[PDB]
Symmetry: C2
Amino acid sequence: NWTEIYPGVWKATVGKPESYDLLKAAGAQPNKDALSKTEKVSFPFANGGVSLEVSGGKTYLRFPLQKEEQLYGFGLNFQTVHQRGKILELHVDHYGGKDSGRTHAPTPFYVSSNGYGVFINSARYIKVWAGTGVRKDSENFPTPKDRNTDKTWSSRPYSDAVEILVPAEGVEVYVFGGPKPIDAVKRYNLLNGGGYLPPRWGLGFTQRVMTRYTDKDVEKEVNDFKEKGYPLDFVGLEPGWQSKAYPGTFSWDKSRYPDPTSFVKKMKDQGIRLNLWINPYISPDAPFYKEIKPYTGSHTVWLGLVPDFTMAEARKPFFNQLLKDQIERGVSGYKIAEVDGYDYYLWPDAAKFPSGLSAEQMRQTYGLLVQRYSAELYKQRNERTFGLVRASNGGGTSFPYVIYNDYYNHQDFITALINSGFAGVLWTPEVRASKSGEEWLRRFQSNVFSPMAMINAWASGTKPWSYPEVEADVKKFALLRMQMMPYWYSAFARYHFEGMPPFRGMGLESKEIKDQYMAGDDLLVAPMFAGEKSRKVVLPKGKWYDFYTGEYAGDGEVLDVTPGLDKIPVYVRDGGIVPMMPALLNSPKSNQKVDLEIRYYGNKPGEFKLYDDDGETFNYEKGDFSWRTIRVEKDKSGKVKGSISAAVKGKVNTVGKVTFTAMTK
Amino acid sequence: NWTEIYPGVWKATVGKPESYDLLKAAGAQPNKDALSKTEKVSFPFANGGVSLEVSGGKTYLRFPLQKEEQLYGFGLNFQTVHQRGKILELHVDHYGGKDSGRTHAPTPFYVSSNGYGVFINSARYIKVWAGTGVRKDSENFPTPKDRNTDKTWSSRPYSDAVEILVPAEGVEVYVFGGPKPIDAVKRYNLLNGGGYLPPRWGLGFTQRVMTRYTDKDVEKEVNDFKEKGYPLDFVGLEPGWQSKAYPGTFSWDKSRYPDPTSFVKKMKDQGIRLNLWINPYISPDAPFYKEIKPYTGSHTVWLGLVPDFTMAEARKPFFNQLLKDQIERGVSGYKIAEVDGYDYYLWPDAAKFPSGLSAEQMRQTYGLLVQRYSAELYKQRNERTFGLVRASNGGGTSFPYVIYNDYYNHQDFITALINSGFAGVLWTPEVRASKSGEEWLRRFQSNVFSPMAMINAWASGTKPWSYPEVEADVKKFALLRMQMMPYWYSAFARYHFEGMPPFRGMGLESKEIKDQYMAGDDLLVAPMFAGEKSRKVVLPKGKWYDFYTGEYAGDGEVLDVTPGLDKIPVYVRDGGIVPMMPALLNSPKSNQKVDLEIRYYGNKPGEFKLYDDDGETFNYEKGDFSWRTIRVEKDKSGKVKGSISAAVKGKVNTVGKVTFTAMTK
Ligand SMILES: O=[N+]([O-])c1ccc(O[C@H]2O[C@H](CO)[C@H](O)[C@H](O)[C@H]2O)cc1
Ligand SMILES: O=[N+]([O-])c1ccc(O[C@H]2O[C@H](CO)[C@H](O)[C@H](O)[C@H]2O)cc1
C-alpha cells in the first residue's frame, strides 16, 4: 500500500526489498522543505490496474496506461524521446549506438503526458516493457483478427500497461503526482535532494588539454587564452598528470608536473582552476595499493584493481589520497572516466566484491559511489566542486557532475540533452574535433547552451580558435556564455531549490521533438547541424521572439529558418528576460559586484527571479542567499520600464548597476 | 564433483538445480549404446582452475583456458565462428542482425580447439564471458602497463577463463572429452539422443506456396512441377490453410480447402506430402479454445492465447486436434513459426504461466516443447516426420526439425550453417526471392547442399523456374539433390547413430573460416555469393579433387577459383565416395530398388558406409537397418575396382545395380 510521504509523493514497499539500492548508494537526502511546499495532489492511479507482486524470486510491477498517454524517460536515451511501445533493460554502459537501455544513466524513472511519474528504486538491471504486453484478461484486449482476410490486422496490437520486472524479492516503488509532467519530474528530483547548486566558475569555459601536456604546456595555453581574449575558468588535465595511468597511481607525474603545489597555485593566481581525470583503477605503484588491495574486487579493469567503495576500508585510502595529494593543493574537481562500460572493459557480472555486493549492483552504482564520496571531500571544506562523470543513475540528481561520453553523433548529442531533463542527471554535448569549421561552430553553439561549456582536447589538441574560418564567431559564443552566466546560475538555482531541470524537452511548461530543447525557463533552442542551411522550428502556443533581434517570431506554429552560420536558432518567450553581465574572461569573485543588462523580450509584462550568493561555498545552506525579483514591461510610449527588488540586509550582494533593454522594438 | 556418466562424459551438480531444464523440457534420452562405444578419455581439465559455486541467488562457473585455445559454439551465430573473447547473453529470439546471444537456438554448449566441450543445462537466459574477464588472482595476470608511456599497452588484456553466470541456485553442468573437437560434439549430440533419422522424402525437394493458395492452386503447381520435370517430395502450406491465422483455429479453411481428406489423398497419390504452417497461438474460433483457455499464459501473441505445453491439460486438446484434423488425414509434418521472437511480438518475461514455470524458461524452451510433442504423434504411428521450426535449444538434437528464419543475408546464412554443427541443431539457408537470376542460382546452389532443399514462396510466389536466365542450371541442381540422396541419407544416419553433424565447419576431422563447410564426410563446400566472379578456397592438408571433373585441386593450400555461374565450388577428399541414385522426381518407396553409381575421387583407396532401411518408419529401432560397406580403388592399369558388402539376411534392401566410376582420370 501507498504511503503519501510528501505532497505528491507516494511510496510502496513490495515484498522484501534488498538492503542496497539507488537512493542508499547515493546517500540521497530528500529536500523535505521544498517538497512540503508542493501542492497536495491526488494519487495518479485512481481507477485500479496497478499490480505489485513477488513470484519466482522476482518482483513484477504493472501500471495502467490510457489511450492518450505518451511516456518519457527511462534514462539518458540518445535516439528516442517518446518511450511508449519500447522495450528496455536498464543497464549502466557506455552508449552503444542504439537505445536498448544500455546507457550512462539508465534512470528507472518515467514520466507520463497525463502528469505523473514512477521510480523503481532498485540497483539491479531492470527490464521494462513500456506498453508492449497484451494481456488476455485486459479490459482493453483487442478483438482477434484474421490475418488471412483482414487488411486491418495489426502486428503490434494495443497494449494498456507498463510492465517492469526486477530481479529481486521485492522493491521500493515511488509514484509522483502532477498536475503536469514537469511537476512529477521536479518532485522526483527533490526526493533526490534537488540538483547540485554549482559554483559560478563551473558555468564558465573549460578547456581540457592533450594527455601528454606538461605544466609548462598548460601555462602556455593559459597565456594564449588570455592573450587572444578568450574566456577560461578551469582547465582539464588528462591522464598524463599521473605518474601512471590505466591503471592509476593517483599521484602527480614527477616529470610532467615536477612541482604540483606551485603549479596549482600559479594557475589559481591567474583565475584558472584545475580538473583532473581519473578512472578509479588502482596501479601497483599507487601509494595505497597494498592497504587497499584486500578491499578490491576479483576482476580488474585495464589491469587495475577495482575498489569496493561500499567499504570504509577502500574509501579511506583512496579519497584520503585525492584529498592530501590534490584537493589540499587546490584542485577544484575531477573528471571520472570509465565507470560505465563496455562489458569487455569493465568487470563481468560474474565478478565478486569483498563487501558481498553483487557485481551487477556495483555496475549500476559505481558512478554514483565515486560522485558521492568525492563530492563529500569538497563539502567538508565548505567548497563547491563541479566536474564530469561517465556514469550515474537514479539517486544521482544532487551530485556536482555532468555526464559526457566518447560517442559523437551531434543530433544524438542533442537528443541526450533533452532526455537529461527526464533522467535526473546533467549532460553536456562536448566539443572535441570536427572535419570542418562549420561543424566546429555548430557544435560549439549547442555546447554553450548546455550544462558545461567545454572543448575536450585530450586527443585532438584543439583550441576554440583552431578553425580559422569560424574563429571570430566561436569567440563571440564563448563570450556570450560568460554574459549569460546570471541566466544560467539562476536556472541552476531552480534545479537545486525546486528540482526544475535547466535543460529539457518541449511541452514541459503531438509527435516527437528530438531536436529542440528549453534552456532555463525562457529560451527555446533549436540547433543547426553541419550540412544544413535551414531547419523547421516548432513553436509552442503563445508568442516567441528572436533571441538576437527581439523581433516577433511566431505563436503556436512551425517556422522555416535559415539562420546563417553565425547564429544558433534561439527564441525567447513573450515577456522573457535574460540578465546579462559583461563579457568577462573569468567568473566573478564573491566579493565582486557586476553590472547587469536586463534583456526583456516581447510585450507581456515579465518577471524573473535572479539568484545571488557567494557562488562558491555552502553558506547558502545557512541562508546566505537571495532571490532578486526583476520585473520589466513597456509603458504607454512603448518605453521600457523595469524594477529589481531591493537587496536583503546582511546577505551577499553581487548585483551592481542594472539597466533594462526592450529587445522587441 | 564430476561423475563419469559415460565414456568421455562427466556431470557435476552445483548447488540446487532447478526442477525444469533443457534436457527435461526436451524429454531427451541419451543414446547409451552409442556412447558406451566411444573411447574412454581423461577429464579435459587436469590442472585445476575450475570453479563452481553459488552465491547471491546465482551460480558462477569458471573453466580455464590455455593460450593456444580457440572456442566454438554458443549456439546459432550468424556472423562469428571463433567465440573466444566474446560476451553473450543466450536468449531465444529471432536473429537481430548481430551476434549477441539472441538467436533461434542459443545452445549453451561450447567446444574448444583443445578437444573438449561444456554444456550448461539451464533453461534460463545465461551470460557468458568467453575469455574477457581478467582476475587479480589469476596465475596469468598480465603485468600492469602505463598507457601514458608504453605503446604496447593493451585495451583488452589477456584473459585465461570462460566465465558463465546462471540466474539460479544451482545448475547441472556436463563436460565432454575429446581427443578432437568433433569428438566432444558427437558425445554432446549422443547425450541428447543423437540427431533425428529423417525419412528419405525429407531430403527431397520442398516447395512452399503463397499464403492464399487454394487446393486447386496447389494441385496446379504440382502438375507444373511434373510437367516441367522438376523434383518435388513435399509441399508447404502457409497460413491460409487455416480458417483463421494469427491467431489460429488449427482447422482447415472451408473456402480454400473445402474437402481436406480428399485433397490430402490426391497429393499423396501423386507422391506429394504436405507440411503445414502453424504458430501455436489460439484463436477464439478454434474448436478447443474454451477447453484450453485456463491452461494458457497471462499474455497473448498476436491476440492468440499461449498454451502452457508443460501441462497435460494444454497438450491434450492442442495435439489431439492436430492428430485428428490433419495427421490422421495424412499430413506429413509441420512448420512451426514465431516461437522465437522478437520481444515485442512474444510474451514478456513479466508474463505468468498456469504451471508456475517462469516466462523466461518458457521462452527458452517453447520451440523444444512444440517439437517434442508434435514429433511424438508421428512416432506413435510408426511414421517419421520432418519439418521446420523457428526456435530450438540445447536438448533439441534428436527432433525432426530444421531451423529457418526471416533474415536473408546470404553470407550470414552460410555462417549459420557452419555454426549449426557446433549447436546441436539443423539449419537451412532457405530460398525465397532474389533481385537477379545470379543471386537466385547461388542461393539455390548452397541450399541443395544443406539439411533441407527448399524454396519458401509464402510471399514471393517463386518457383524453381521463375528466373529464366538461370532456369536450366537450377533444374540441374534440383536433380543433383535427388541423385545425391543416398549420400545425404547416410550422412544423416551418422548424425543419428554417432552424433556426427552432417554440416559443420572447417578443421573438424588458424584464422576464422566463415564461408566454407563440410557436407557429409567427403565434401568441402565453398559457396559463391552474388556479384563475385571468384573466391579463395582454403583446402585442408591432404589431397582434394574437383567435385565436377575429378581433377586434382590441391593439398593444404589456398586456391583462387573462378567457377562460373553454373557451378558451386565443391571439392572431394582423396578417396572420397559419393553414391548417386538416378535423377528421380520423387523419393523412392521402401519396397523399391534403386541403382547406384559410386563416384570415387582421387587415388587413395576409399571406403564408404551406405545406410539402408525402409526410409519412413521406426522399424530401424527394432534393428531393421543395414550398413553396406563400399570400397573403391584403382588397380595397376589405373582401372577402377570396387566392392560393396553383401546384403544382410532378413533386412530391407533398396540397393539395386551398383557400378563404380573413377572420377579422377
Ligand atoms: O581508445 N580507447 O580505448 C579509448 C579509451 C578511452 C577514451 O576516452 C576517455 O579517456 C580519455 C583519456 O584517456 C578522455 O578523458 C576521454 O574524455 C574519456 O572518455 C577514448 C578512447
Ligand atoms: O510482416 N510480418 O510481421 C511478418 C511476419 C511473419 C513472417 O514470417 C513467417 O510466417 C510466414 C507466414 O505468414 C512464413 O511462414 C515465414 O516463413 C515465417 O517466418 C514474415 C513477416
